[PDB]
């Protein structure tokens, strides 16, 4: 039952493009990629080659194919301890998934700051540009279970665990800069409304159902993050191509004791990019693991996810200087008013070895801060501080979840806590309490100070009566959705209209749709009217006369809110499909592959069957996938070289591949006789912006395609796609 | 610094006698003691001296005395993550106790065979007299909770984990050679009957209640082990002075495939010794931790518990040679018929560092066997095989309880099991199934063989129908109880009678007592009449005429069944109380301590207050405890030196000390005017056997006392003790 | 039939003095003692007389004495679903004990006010003397495990659950009027110092050990409750003869919104009474269930524990 | 047991039998039924041995396994008839 004689079962332990080798555990794929956290996990890494199969008690197994029975056709016997331990472990494999963010994908990496930030914070991980901090990052969706699809419309989580010399700091953020609700007390109501409805547990991974829109229509504080979710921000192309945000205002505390308010940002160095709805939704069917796969394969290829940490900083004396409350997590701070200061870079450069042990069991919690940081009274942040530790208790089995290897600090940890389920650490301290004399009071408290000090809270003044009451300053719900709307390009606005229209069409109770449209009329009447037209709703005279909400501190738009208004495209790590024929013109394929290689763009060679085809010069070309098996959904652009085009000219899958790519706004390039495919996408002979065509592939043809790919999608084609049957 | 300036907070890291120093974690008390398992635990041992106090995430704490509040008389705030982590861990410290044997005391040690047993077993741990195998041993009671008392009347558990090079072997035995029941189906019934009654949860630690004796009276198979429990075997002096037994017949399998039946024995090298019932019972009140303390203090003193492993071996062809079924766990194999062959020595030489992490979390299970051993169809053993894996699941939190450090093998273990709560090992195998080609099928099965082979079951023939039926050969209940009863000394018989008499007097429903007396009359009429007289019950003419059961294979006694018939007294590690007065004669004390020291016997110097006293010659004498503080129950003998005897002659506690010791059959030695105490225990002037007396405490005064100690207790005193008001 | 012909296996369902009859579940000893909470539990009470022995799935069992085997001296078979269920249930009977107060004894009863307290509180259970509120009360020690002894020297817990028409109110108190420490951040340190020491898990049920006195010596705020514990308050004669206190100042709030500060007390109508030390210590050996037994038997006798 | 939290999963409403169920099993996490039987073991006399075993019969009888003949040696072996 062995491996093939040629060694082809084992992936090369070097960087390789997606599809070139089977994927593997990180420590086998990239054994030389190290950091202090990855090294610390070596105590618990288990090999396998050359080892005997055993029970968990170390007894070697002779026959792992059969249960013990009284005769070979007889009953199974109770005394088969080998069968019993294997089946017992299997029967207890599953642990509860996370209440929210159950679907997620993670990797290891490292961070380092660009310069010391000691004038604004004493946090050790930001004190020295040459001090590197290992990280572990998990990206997630919010609503769906751990077996749900990746490219759903949803907010995404972006959680980073920094293993610092002064403790673990978890920055537990999302990919939009606000949340849906203002006070943690409402979190279970909001989550219950977006999650599958309770009688039948439908729908998975979707906010397109009555209960979500019922809640939104009755809680207008949700409308800002709803706008984000209905835009193409809700359907990122990759976890590499979305922004992150801590949402809450936190504090930085320097060695002099000065507090500065801060909001955290991650900027993707691969740039911002999103799918379009129909593409996203079909990809949940054709590849429900698309983002998990893309992240893993980018790290294997050396296309490491990179992100810049950024801080918006506000001095303490400017707390009340905006027209919204800084402590309101439904409000963003526009970068036109407070710029994001660049702070450091994070690089994700190694995949885990075992998804369950490292990803599934990782525990992130925003209460895990370090000296030099502090909280604020944001009432959503305040309630989060209760929930992360308590949940990690039923999910991970007990109070020792910090001893699960992925969660362990790499700095020292010593205290008087003892026992609890699955206790690993064996304490030798004669004392388990303090103050004690019997161990000379060790381990000891440490006064706060500029470095290596004990944690002390910032001594914020508190004055008020004990109340359950929302601050009046939080009761403004429409100005930030309007600012967002007006900062989007015209095509992004169209996609927001379509996202609300699609979702509310799936709400069965028509009055809920009408109440959402009335909320939209309080944001922008153009938006309201465009959604109402798709729902066959007519706005009333009163609704047409609602006064628009005020500008946000004088702003009419802020272009940093748009994905696309400011070009930021980076083609390295993108992928093109190359549709082969049985006699490819090898000069075209040479020119194509050379130009893609120079820009770090990968190729996938597709055909109508698997195996190999031979080019005109004898080059044998292995086929990555069939046209049906790896649809246009999964690539960024499509190139069709010349050769024997008659082999594929009448193939329905090949023609549909181009039609889907065209409808989804992807760049298409056709060389030579492949130009006959222009006819299937039912447009021009003089050509069209977005379709690169030439007698042969070459420097100029590839340059033009690569420039298209740098702009991500061909937005100009939008009006030509409603007629295409695809 | 809170430690005293003179360093007297820290115990000496060297062997010291009981009470000389405070006790400590084993690796701090005996850092030079090692073995392969202790060395492998080093990676999870945590120190304390010189480290900062932190959260579990490694953040240094500055103030561990106060919660975060809004003003120093204000409400506590939810953002106090340091308080929250500390209270959350504490809130979750407890795990379920074991269903039975919840009260237990454990130690590390090692085992070595005296010679290779390869002719009868291929078990690696028995293959070489130079091969030393680490062990971890837990002794326990059965019925009471983890917080119940040590010196109850009960069966004791004796469980040994051997960390072999071919797997963990757990020998999970008790301190009697049979069990109460024949088939595992009845275990919940028996245990429910012995355990506190379900309406009110009384009594703890005791079988002296209606439900236990109701079950016994209805299930005469229980009578053999009940006889053992009612004897002084139910009240051992120490875990170091009891026997252990595997109970079941197992098999040894050699390299040629030959099976030999085997029953396992532990022989205590300190000899056999037990308390008397009134002493045991009072000790549960004065020191409920007396056996746990004694085991720990013996190891800290260097009085290491030592046991010889022995095998009773029966050839396969002798399966049916006895009057009873070898597979019946209510029958013993008399050592007159099959002698115990010595196999090796186990020495327990290190205490744990942390009781919870190493004792509470240890998991022993008799299904953990290694190549060279195998099971038999004993129907109690068969059912045990189901129970120990399952229970260790709710108890220890999941299917990865072998990764808890004390449970881990020291030999390699590799397999395709994955996940489960609290998974520590991070598997790098590309495959999690076999057969596989992707990892060339590793880890791989191993054929059985003479050494280092895979486990294969012995191919025993099975023939019969699927039935729920007890074998007729098991249906004999009285002959082994009678052999036991006949093998006892007269004083041991008297204690058995008194054990039954006391227990049945606590049974509230009189017919249950009557039904039990009827079962006794099927064993031995003398026994049944003596118990009946104590209960005011008169035997009928029919009961007086029940034919005794037959002898066992012609035996009418076997002295190996008695604790005391064949003297095996060791005094090393025993303890003597020395009662001081305010002006002790130093020449007496010097003599006493010198002789005790030469024989390895400990002393505790007692008085009517703490502090010190001064001898006649000015020597300062440190007092260990007061008369009331360390009662006679806790020592093996009592010595009173001369001096100012009028200081203590009318001290009620000093008098009571001697009466208690006397009642409990302990040797008592009186020097000089300490002979005035004869009147308080009613001793005549010619003296009496068991009271050592003289003008001073030498020539042969110490030799006579140490001779009485070697014989444990003064049995011949028993007729005199009923008069003494104590 | 295994019961004796004369029926002396079954205690009479009428009050009887301690030792006169075997003790029995409450609903069999006193079937006509009722309150709203005891009546609401009727849906989950299960009987036994005249019913067949079954699996948990309702399958009747024919032989509850033997495992299924291949021949009557053969190996046990994995298809024995009856054995498997019965052993699986037994293997999971235990749950974690309480972190503190693990040893306790409980009874049902009821509470009634002497007068309407509406001028000081709007709490509905205090609003009318004819309003009866069921209670369930658990008394406990603090340090020992659930199988430790009753007459140790310790603080005792006195916890009452009031099943009111406006919600459950739990009054979770002890038998002395203060506690050992000031701020909850220190609770795990104090409890760890009083509990059995971590290396060897001794001593059970006792504060007479180095780490407790270490902490006391270093934390003089403890000294007041230590005084109480070393007095005979630390060794009550019975749960019926000790006082109870909520310890903390709470607030009462009336219908006008006025707050009054309040501390809560329970006064034993049987009076206050304690053991002496040598008697208490010896009793932990002769009857470690002494307090649990005394409470049960007092109720079976009609000597109901009463507290104001 | 691990999925549903303990050995009393039969008392979760959807899993409950609609016929009678009585036995001597007790306790476990999440125990809903409050047993009033003085006995939690059998054989017992203190409750006249109830609940009681029921012999097999044509209707409403105790379960008994069919007495199939077993013959062979203790082996980990796939029957050749399955190959
Ligand atoms: C700004 C608003 C919030 C953001 C950005 C946020 C972000 C996230 C992210 C990214 C995760 C997944 C961490 C991972 O990958 O494992 C998560 C999990 C969780 N969140 Fe939050 N969340 C927010 C609000 C809240 C609120 C208000 C609560 C409850 C009061 C909460 C309770 C949870 C819980 C229960 C989990 C599961 C944690 C676990 O099992 O380990 N979240 N959150
Ligand atoms: C010969 C008869 C038996 C002997 C000598 C025996 C011995 C022991 C001993 C010494 C322990 C304590 C191990 C330790 O110190 O942790 C124990 C625990 C246990 N026994 Fe047995 N026992 C016997 C029969 C049974 C049977 C028939 C069953 C169930 C079918 C059973 C179920 C258990 C369970 C559930 C535990 C607690 C295990 C744990 O939580 O780790 N015992 N037994
Ligand atoms: C005046 C001070 C306190 C008193 C009077 C008090 C009283 C009690 C009582 C009577 C019980 C047992 C309830 C029962 O019978 O089930 C109990 C249990 C408990 N107490 Fe407190 N206690 C106090 C302080 C604390 C503090 C400061 C903490 C933690 C910060 C705490 C945590 C606990 C916990 C964890 C249990 C176990 C509860 C359970 O498992 O159900 N106690 N306490």
mmCIF file of N, CA and C in Angstrom, chain A residues 2-3 10 44 46 48 51 53-54 56-57 60-62 64-65 79 84-85 89 93 168 361 382 385 400 413-415 417-418 420 423 426 428 430 434 439-440 444-446 452 455, chain B residues 1 3 10 44 46 48 53-54 56-57 60-61 64-65 79 84-85 89 93 168 356 361 382 385 400 413-415 417-420 423 426 428 434 439-440 443-446 452 455:
data_model
loop_
_atom_site.group_PDB
_atom_site.id
_atom_site.type_symbol
_atom_site.label_atom_id
_atom_site.label_comp_id
_atom_site.label_asym_id
_atom_site.label_seq_id
_atom_site.Cartn_x
_atom_site.Cartn_y
_atom_site.Cartn_z
ATOM 1 N N UNK A 2 1.916 1.167 -0.801
ATOM 2 C CA UNK A 2 2.877 2.076 -0.476
ATOM 3 C C UNK A 2 2.792 3.294 -1.461
ATOM 4 N N UNK A 3 3.707 4.178 -1.173
ATOM 5 C CA UNK A 3 3.940 5.345 -1.964
ATOM 6 C C UNK A 3 4.359 4.906 -3.375
ATOM 7 N N UNK A 10 4.797 13.159 -2.357
ATOM 8 C CA UNK A 10 5.316 14.136 -1.393
ATOM 9 C C UNK A 10 5.627 15.500 -2.064
ATOM 10 N N UNK A 44 5.344 19.887 21.062
ATOM 11 C CA UNK A 44 4.134 19.121 20.888
ATOM 12 C C UNK A 44 3.898 18.640 19.468
ATOM 13 N N UNK A 46 4.178 16.207 16.411
ATOM 14 C CA UNK A 46 4.354 14.744 16.387
ATOM 15 C C UNK A 46 4.627 14.424 14.919
ATOM 16 N N UNK A 48 5.844 10.987 12.298
ATOM 17 C CA UNK A 48 5.162 9.750 11.890
ATOM 18 C C UNK A 48 6.024 8.795 11.101
ATOM 19 N N UNK A 51 7.857 5.321 12.372
ATOM 20 C CA UNK A 51 7.367 4.973 13.684
ATOM 21 C C UNK A 51 6.298 3.911 13.559
ATOM 22 N N UNK A 53 2.821 2.012 14.516
ATOM 23 C CA UNK A 53 1.463 2.423 14.915
ATOM 24 C C UNK A 53 1.196 1.868 16.325
ATOM 25 N N UNK A 54 0.679 2.731 17.221
ATOM 26 C CA UNK A 54 0.426 2.294 18.582
ATOM 27 C C UNK A 54 -0.922 2.741 19.108
ATOM 28 N N UNK A 56 -2.812 4.869 22.278
ATOM 29 C CA UNK A 56 -2.354 6.062 22.997
ATOM 30 C C UNK A 56 -1.546 5.783 24.260
ATOM 31 N N UNK A 57 -1.516 4.499 24.746
ATOM 32 C CA UNK A 57 -0.707 4.110 25.824
ATOM 33 C C UNK A 57 0.661 3.539 25.369
ATOM 34 N N UNK A 60 2.209 -1.328 20.651
ATOM 35 C CA UNK A 60 2.207 -1.510 19.213
ATOM 36 C C UNK A 60 1.059 -2.375 18.742
ATOM 37 N N UNK A 61 0.457 -1.921 17.635
ATOM 38 C CA UNK A 61 -0.690 -2.626 17.035
ATOM 39 C C UNK A 61 -0.145 -3.533 15.948
ATOM 40 N N UNK A 62 -0.572 -4.819 15.953
ATOM 41 C CA UNK A 62 -0.249 -5.753 14.864
ATOM 42 C C UNK A 62 -1.280 -5.730 13.703
ATOM 43 N N UNK A 64 -4.504 -3.523 12.374
ATOM 44 C CA UNK A 64 -5.434 -2.367 12.540
ATOM 45 C C UNK A 64 -6.535 -2.470 11.486
ATOM 46 N N UNK A 65 -6.805 -3.690 11.006
ATOM 47 C CA UNK A 65 -7.899 -3.870 10.039
ATOM 48 C C UNK A 65 -9.073 -4.616 10.594
ATOM 49 N N UNK A 79 -13.313 -7.410 25.035
ATOM 50 C CA UNK A 79 -11.907 -7.263 25.475
ATOM 51 C C UNK A 79 -10.975 -6.662 24.409
ATOM 52 N N UNK A 84 -11.560 -0.413 21.081
ATOM 53 C CA UNK A 84 -12.351 0.453 21.949
ATOM 54 C C UNK A 84 -11.721 1.835 22.075
ATOM 55 N N UNK A 85 -10.380 1.901 22.207
ATOM 56 C CA UNK A 85 -9.712 3.209 22.357
ATOM 57 C C UNK A 85 -9.788 3.946 20.998
ATOM 58 N N UNK A 89 -11.886 7.465 20.908
ATOM 59 C CA UNK A 89 -11.338 8.793 20.567
ATOM 60 C C UNK A 89 -12.139 9.380 19.439
ATOM 61 N N UNK A 93 -14.345 13.358 19.003
ATOM 62 C CA UNK A 93 -13.474 14.342 18.273
ATOM 63 C C UNK A 93 -13.950 15.758 18.291
ATOM 64 N N UNK A 168 0.475 38.354 25.982
ATOM 65 C CA UNK A 168 -0.260 38.302 24.711
ATOM 66 C C UNK A 168 -1.197 39.477 24.568
ATOM 67 N N UNK A 361 -8.734 25.444 17.916
ATOM 68 C CA UNK A 361 -8.550 25.680 19.384
ATOM 69 C C UNK A 361 -7.943 27.086 19.739
ATOM 70 N N UNK A 382 -16.994 47.469 26.400
ATOM 71 C CA UNK A 382 -17.102 47.132 27.809
ATOM 72 C C UNK A 382 -17.726 45.730 27.991
ATOM 73 N N UNK A 385 -15.682 42.591 27.125
ATOM 74 C CA UNK A 385 -14.710 42.111 28.178
ATOM 75 C C UNK A 385 -15.241 40.993 29.053
ATOM 76 N N UNK A 400 -8.077 26.045 31.723
ATOM 77 C CA UNK A 400 -6.691 25.958 31.322
ATOM 78 C C UNK A 400 -6.481 26.076 29.791
ATOM 79 N N UNK A 413 5.082 33.174 32.555
ATOM 80 C CA UNK A 413 3.806 33.382 33.232
ATOM 81 C C UNK A 413 3.839 32.535 34.532
ATOM 82 N N UNK A 414 3.563 33.183 35.653
ATOM 83 C CA UNK A 414 3.586 32.530 36.950
ATOM 84 C C UNK A 414 2.579 33.201 37.840
ATOM 85 N N UNK A 415 1.776 32.383 38.512
ATOM 86 C CA UNK A 415 0.791 32.961 39.446
ATOM 87 C C UNK A 415 0.321 31.870 40.411
ATOM 88 N N UNK A 417 -2.791 30.566 40.557
ATOM 89 C CA UNK A 417 -3.981 29.795 40.074
ATOM 90 C C UNK A 417 -3.596 28.314 39.961
ATOM 91 N N UNK A 418 -4.552 27.436 40.292
ATOM 92 C CA UNK A 418 -4.232 26.003 40.349
ATOM 93 C C UNK A 418 -5.408 25.207 39.810
ATOM 94 N N UNK A 420 -8.263 22.910 37.892
ATOM 95 C CA UNK A 420 -9.111 23.000 36.692
ATOM 96 C C UNK A 420 -8.873 21.838 35.719
ATOM 97 N N UNK A 423 -5.349 20.234 33.531
ATOM 98 C CA UNK A 423 -4.190 21.017 34.002
ATOM 99 C C UNK A 423 -2.868 20.392 33.570
ATOM 100 N N UNK A 426 2.673 21.639 36.231
ATOM 101 C CA UNK A 426 2.799 21.042 37.552
ATOM 102 C C UNK A 426 3.527 22.087 38.418
ATOM 103 N N UNK A 428 5.372 23.774 41.445
ATOM 104 C CA UNK A 428 6.173 23.310 42.547
ATOM 105 C C UNK A 428 6.137 24.320 43.694
ATOM 106 N N UNK A 430 5.638 26.008 47.003
ATOM 107 C CA UNK A 430 4.989 25.519 48.213
ATOM 108 C C UNK A 430 3.694 26.302 48.582
ATOM 109 N N UNK A 434 -1.165 34.390 48.038
ATOM 110 C CA UNK A 434 -0.276 35.492 48.502
ATOM 111 C C UNK A 434 -1.201 36.498 49.241
ATOM 112 N N UNK A 439 7.064 30.936 50.693
ATOM 113 C CA UNK A 439 7.892 31.015 49.469
ATOM 114 C C UNK A 439 8.392 32.412 49.303
ATOM 115 N N UNK A 440 8.604 33.117 50.457
ATOM 116 C CA UNK A 440 9.061 34.521 50.398
ATOM 117 C C UNK A 440 8.287 35.386 49.438
ATOM 118 N N UNK A 444 6.042 37.590 42.762
ATOM 119 C CA UNK A 444 5.705 38.898 43.332
ATOM 120 C C UNK A 444 5.091 39.887 42.366
ATOM 121 N N UNK A 445 4.208 40.707 42.909
ATOM 122 C CA UNK A 445 3.705 41.883 42.199
ATOM 123 C C UNK A 445 4.901 42.789 41.753
ATOM 124 N N UNK A 446 4.668 43.534 40.691
ATOM 125 C CA UNK A 446 5.705 44.445 40.050
ATOM 126 C C UNK A 446 5.037 45.843 39.857
ATOM 127 N N UNK A 452 8.691 46.784 31.401
ATOM 128 C CA UNK A 452 8.667 45.611 32.255
ATOM 129 C C UNK A 452 7.920 45.871 33.539
ATOM 130 N N UNK A 455 0.745 45.984 35.250
ATOM 131 C CA UNK A 455 -0.320 46.717 34.614
ATOM 132 C C UNK A 455 -1.058 47.611 35.651
ATOM 133 N N UNK B 1 10.381 41.454 51.455
ATOM 134 C CA UNK B 1 10.525 40.102 52.048
ATOM 135 C C UNK B 1 9.758 39.748 53.364
ATOM 136 N N UNK B 3 9.548 36.319 54.390
ATOM 137 C CA UNK B 3 10.161 35.112 55.021
ATOM 138 C C UNK B 3 10.961 35.578 56.245
ATOM 139 N N UNK B 10 11.796 27.364 55.114
ATOM 140 C CA UNK B 10 12.121 26.398 54.049
ATOM 141 C C UNK B 10 12.544 25.051 54.569
ATOM 142 N N UNK B 44 6.984 20.226 32.156
ATOM 143 C CA UNK B 44 5.783 20.910 32.596
ATOM 144 C C UNK B 44 5.884 21.318 34.050
ATOM 145 N N UNK B 46 6.672 23.910 36.849
ATOM 146 C CA UNK B 46 6.750 25.395 36.860
ATOM 147 C C UNK B 46 7.323 25.763 38.266
ATOM 148 N N UNK B 48 8.867 29.337 40.629
ATOM 149 C CA UNK B 48 8.180 30.440 41.228
ATOM 150 C C UNK B 48 9.140 31.471 41.745
ATOM 151 N N UNK B 53 4.642 38.019 39.265
ATOM 152 C CA UNK B 53 3.247 37.534 39.276
ATOM 153 C C UNK B 53 2.575 38.059 37.971
ATOM 154 N N UNK B 54 1.891 37.161 37.204
ATOM 155 C CA UNK B 54 1.305 37.567 35.934
ATOM 156 C C UNK B 54 -0.089 37.000 35.767
ATOM 157 N N UNK B 56 -2.518 34.645 33.216
ATOM 158 C CA UNK B 56 -2.196 33.498 32.374
ATOM 159 C C UNK B 56 -1.753 33.890 31.025
ATOM 160 N N UNK B 57 -1.928 35.150 30.578
ATOM 161 C CA UNK B 57 -1.451 35.558 29.258
ATOM 162 C C UNK B 57 -0.095 36.227 29.340
ATOM 163 N N UNK B 60 2.261 41.248 33.562
ATOM 164 C CA UNK B 60 2.634 41.495 34.969
ATOM 165 C C UNK B 60 1.543 42.236 35.704
ATOM 166 N N UNK B 61 1.268 41.774 36.904
ATOM 167 C CA UNK B 61 0.249 42.364 37.785
ATOM 168 C C UNK B 61 0.962 43.317 38.721
ATOM 169 N N UNK B 64 -2.238 43.005 43.368
ATOM 170 C CA UNK B 64 -3.024 41.760 43.438
ATOM 171 C C UNK B 64 -3.886 41.774 44.686
ATOM 172 N N UNK B 65 -4.124 42.970 45.300
ATOM 173 C CA UNK B 65 -4.954 43.059 46.494
ATOM 174 C C UNK B 65 -6.294 43.722 46.293
ATOM 175 N N UNK B 79 -14.444 46.083 33.249
ATOM 176 C CA UNK B 79 -13.135 46.021 32.553
ATOM 177 C C UNK B 79 -11.941 45.475 33.369
ATOM 178 N N UNK B 84 -11.110 39.250 36.760
ATOM 179 C CA UNK B 84 -11.981 38.282 36.036
ATOM 180 C C UNK B 84 -11.260 36.964 35.717
ATOM 181 N N UNK B 85 -10.048 37.061 35.186
ATOM 182 C CA UNK B 85 -9.283 35.811 34.965
ATOM 183 C C UNK B 85 -9.018 35.033 36.229
ATOM 184 N N UNK B 89 -10.705 31.326 36.908
ATOM 185 C CA UNK B 89 -10.001 30.092 37.086
ATOM 186 C C UNK B 89 -10.433 29.415 38.351
ATOM 187 N N UNK B 93 -12.151 25.261 39.380
ATOM 188 C CA UNK B 93 -11.052 24.405 39.792
ATOM 189 C C UNK B 93 -11.380 22.941 39.908
ATOM 190 N N UNK B 168 2.312 1.509 28.498
ATOM 191 C CA UNK B 168 1.832 1.518 29.891
ATOM 192 C C UNK B 168 1.081 0.261 30.260
ATOM 193 N N UNK B 356 -3.175 17.683 42.929
ATOM 194 C CA UNK B 356 -4.170 17.669 41.860
ATOM 195 C C UNK B 356 -3.611 17.240 40.514
ATOM 196 N N UNK B 361 -5.503 13.736 38.762
ATOM 197 C CA UNK B 361 -5.667 13.532 37.312
ATOM 198 C C UNK B 361 -5.102 12.167 36.835
ATOM 199 N N UNK B 382 -13.919 -8.954 32.492
ATOM 200 C CA UNK B 382 -14.444 -8.646 31.131
ATOM 201 C C UNK B 382 -15.207 -7.335 31.171
ATOM 202 N N UNK B 385 -13.294 -3.925 31.474
ATOM 203 C CA UNK B 385 -12.661 -3.424 30.253
ATOM 204 C C UNK B 385 -13.449 -2.336 29.579
ATOM 205 N N UNK B 400 -8.443 12.979 25.252
ATOM 206 C CA UNK B 400 -6.965 13.200 25.290
ATOM 207 C C UNK B 400 -6.406 13.141 26.708
ATOM 208 N N UNK B 413 4.558 6.953 21.044
ATOM 209 C CA UNK B 413 3.221 6.558 20.674
ATOM 210 C C UNK B 413 2.815 7.427 19.447
ATOM 211 N N UNK B 414 2.343 6.757 18.410
ATOM 212 C CA UNK B 414 1.985 7.394 17.145
ATOM 213 C C UNK B 414 0.825 6.670 16.516
ATOM 214 N N UNK B 415 -0.168 7.413 16.071
ATOM 215 C CA UNK B 415 -1.346 6.774 15.461
ATOM 216 C C UNK B 415 -2.132 7.753 14.677
ATOM 217 N N UNK B 417 -5.259 8.840 15.359
ATOM 218 C CA UNK B 417 -6.372 9.494 16.128
ATOM 219 C C UNK B 417 -6.079 11.046 16.109
ATOM 220 N N UNK B 418 -7.164 11.819 16.077
ATOM 221 C CA UNK B 418 -6.953 13.278 15.936
ATOM 222 C C UNK B 418 -7.976 13.995 16.821
ATOM 223 N N UNK B 419 -7.695 15.278 17.143
ATOM 224 C CA UNK B 419 -8.770 16.194 17.712
ATOM 225 C C UNK B 419 -9.243 15.785 19.050
ATOM 226 N N UNK B 420 -10.494 16.141 19.417
ATOM 227 C CA UNK B 420 -10.954 15.919 20.815
ATOM 228 C C UNK B 420 -10.590 17.146 21.648
ATOM 229 N N UNK B 423 -6.726 19.021 22.927
ATOM 230 C CA UNK B 423 -5.700 18.292 22.149
ATOM 231 C C UNK B 423 -4.401 19.025 22.219
ATOM 232 N N UNK B 426 0.297 18.148 18.138
ATOM 233 C CA UNK B 426 0.061 18.753 16.862
ATOM 234 C C UNK B 426 0.658 17.782 15.823
ATOM 235 N N UNK B 428 1.834 16.259 12.376
ATOM 236 C CA UNK B 428 2.287 16.734 11.109
ATOM 237 C C UNK B 428 2.091 15.690 10.012
ATOM 238 N N UNK B 434 -5.313 5.067 7.623
ATOM 239 C CA UNK B 434 -4.488 4.030 6.953
ATOM 240 C C UNK B 434 -5.478 2.967 6.487
ATOM 241 N N UNK B 439 1.690 9.112 2.971
ATOM 242 C CA UNK B 439 2.796 9.129 3.899
ATOM 243 C C UNK B 439 3.442 7.760 3.932
ATOM 244 N N UNK B 440 3.421 7.053 2.784
ATOM 245 C CA UNK B 440 3.983 5.698 2.609
ATOM 246 C C UNK B 440 3.515 4.779 3.753
ATOM 247 N N UNK B 443 2.302 6.021 10.518
ATOM 248 C CA UNK B 443 2.978 4.954 11.210
ATOM 249 C C UNK B 443 2.376 3.557 10.855
ATOM 250 N N UNK B 444 3.220 2.529 10.854
ATOM 251 C CA UNK B 444 2.816 1.218 10.295
ATOM 252 C C UNK B 444 2.623 0.148 11.388
ATOM 253 N N UNK B 445 1.749 -0.791 11.098
ATOM 254 C CA UNK B 445 1.488 -1.922 11.967
ATOM 255 C C UNK B 445 2.834 -2.728 12.097
ATOM 256 N N UNK B 446 2.932 -3.474 13.167
ATOM 257 C CA UNK B 446 4.116 -4.283 13.480
ATOM 258 C C UNK B 446 3.626 -5.710 13.787
ATOM 259 N N UNK B 452 9.439 -6.356 21.046
ATOM 260 C CA UNK B 452 9.097 -5.176 20.313
ATOM 261 C C UNK B 452 8.055 -5.443 19.196
ATOM 262 N N UNK B 455 0.777 -6.187 19.415
ATOM 263 C CA UNK B 455 -0.041 -7.036 20.288
ATOM 264 C C UNK B 455 -0.979 -7.925 19.450
#
